Amino acid sequence: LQGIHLSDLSYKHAILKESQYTIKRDVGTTTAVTPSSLQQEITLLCGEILYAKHADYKYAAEIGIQYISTALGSERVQQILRNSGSEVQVVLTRTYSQMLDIHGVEKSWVEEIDKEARKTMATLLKESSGNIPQNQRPSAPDTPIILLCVGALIFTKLASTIEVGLETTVRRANRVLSDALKRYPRMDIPKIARSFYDLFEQKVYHRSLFIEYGKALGSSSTGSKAESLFVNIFMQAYGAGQTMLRWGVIARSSNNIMLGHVSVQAELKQVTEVYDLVREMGPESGLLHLRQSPKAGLLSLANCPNFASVVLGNASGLGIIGMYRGRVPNTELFSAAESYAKSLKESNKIN
Amino acid sequence: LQGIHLSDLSYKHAILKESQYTIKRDVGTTTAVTPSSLQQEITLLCGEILYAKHADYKYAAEIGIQYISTALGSERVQQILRNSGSEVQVVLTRTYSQMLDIHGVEKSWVEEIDKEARKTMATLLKESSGNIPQNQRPSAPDTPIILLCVGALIFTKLASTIEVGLETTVRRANRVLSDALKRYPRMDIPKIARSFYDLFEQKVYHRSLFIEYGKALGSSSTGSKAESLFVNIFMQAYGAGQTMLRWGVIARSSNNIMLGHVSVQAELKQVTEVYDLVREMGPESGLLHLRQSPKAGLLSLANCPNFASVVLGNASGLGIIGMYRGRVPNTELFSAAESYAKSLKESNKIN
């Protein structure tokens, strides 16, 4: 009885982490970066996307990534993409005639977005009294962070479906980015958000670049109010892909009686093993599903189904479940759990 | 159920703190400093803003920051700007025929301020009996500190709004700065406070410079009453942007019964996690919102709606809430906590 122990999940994690062989992916592909000396240039484009109405927003995500490249530096971004498991060579961007030339992003798109911005600015200046503030202009230094805030909104909804991600991005951007939607009325959150989702699907090393930018920005001593907003949304993205662990600790806090069930008590050992694996991985365990790290799925609580049923029932009783489409394996446990959770929530008690 | 534990907030701070990459911003920008060799000159300017009635008070904040630069030194100020995450290139200050040519400050403005002060001095010397005391003249050595005191008053309200900040600055400066107002009858605290708010919003690295001056002044072995007043106000700004944590420890000190409610006791774990993160950051945690450090927002108690509602209710019962504009998520807890806090306040019990 005492000596019959397995510790399967610790062995699996040790098997995965202890490889001395590294696999090279994206071996023949080249991405684009913009050197920090061109920050002031890419601050213009990142704004000329916002304050005008464009037919196409296809490469707006790449433009935000170019701003991230300028913020970190071309050499540091190359190192970030090389330490991210991708053998992607990096191409520098060139200013020509001034305008920008970015690898991959066609120059027709750049010249079109610039021309639309110029025409809109002329229309808004001629018909007005020549009075446009500093924060209503594409030159403003917080426009790239506004684009990256749309990107960070779509970043949180990366473990979800594209349609759900776009819906949530639009809803949360009409609130979070209310000031920007006052200063730049013509910015199209659906299309910019869909561009960011497309980028984060096609280029997975750019998830790592985005995460490094979030780290660097949060480590900064000072920042504008847009950078603080970006960091807040980025931290809202932290636990993405592992809401079941969060609702499990929530079920423990709620003291759900059906956690004492026979099946839940039978599965608590493997549950604690999953949580111990989370602790053993450490601070990077939250970014596993964001990075699309193959090591994720070691943190799934799927093989313990009755604990998951009880946890989803507790969440439903608390009303927290929302529209979470996760499967409920056993329905009886789920129903009893939500009954008790609602009964506890309704009653007001003092300890 | 002992192992069902996550510790998300510590992991988020670990990610933000453990960054191997440094951000780069304001790359192509420059700012002005004034060497200590010009302090005796900048003092004059910093006082010629105070005893005359000027049409434009646009750059008074820049003149206060110039005096700070004279105090710390040009090289130390450049280092301070560099370690604040901003790659602003310091531009030195020169003299011309003497007056100052400060970078980014129009010479027309400096000439206007000097001429207005000279005309006012001539008018108050010709009509009056010619008994101007040593403290009433512009070349007084505490005038730069008197201007920086208005700056420090508006500094304590950088987390608040502009209108609240200006109203509070004027209200508090009629009493905090009564002696300076007597010495300089015509000093416009509203316009100078507006100038300082504009500087703090536009140039965020000057928040770091202003904090470094506060530290270099508080660490001094001796000081005048003006510098002691400035340090008093600067320390009154310490917990800016985090009044919810202060009110939470107030509620715990008040032994509010609704802290023992079921939901409050449910959220107390992560509340204590936030306080542990506060202790982990240490002395510089208070200056996070003043600096607009993007790392601020890890200290938010918005993810504990019931604890926040109880804290706000306790504050409202004790009369501390004043006119606080935060949200009360759970109104029943807020009202119950307010009732208990009023009941405890009314009763006078001595042990």
Added chain:
RNA sequence: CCCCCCCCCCCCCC
């Protein structure tokens, strides 16, 4: 196989 919900922050007085 796995994932799937919601959610910027701040705001008083001295």
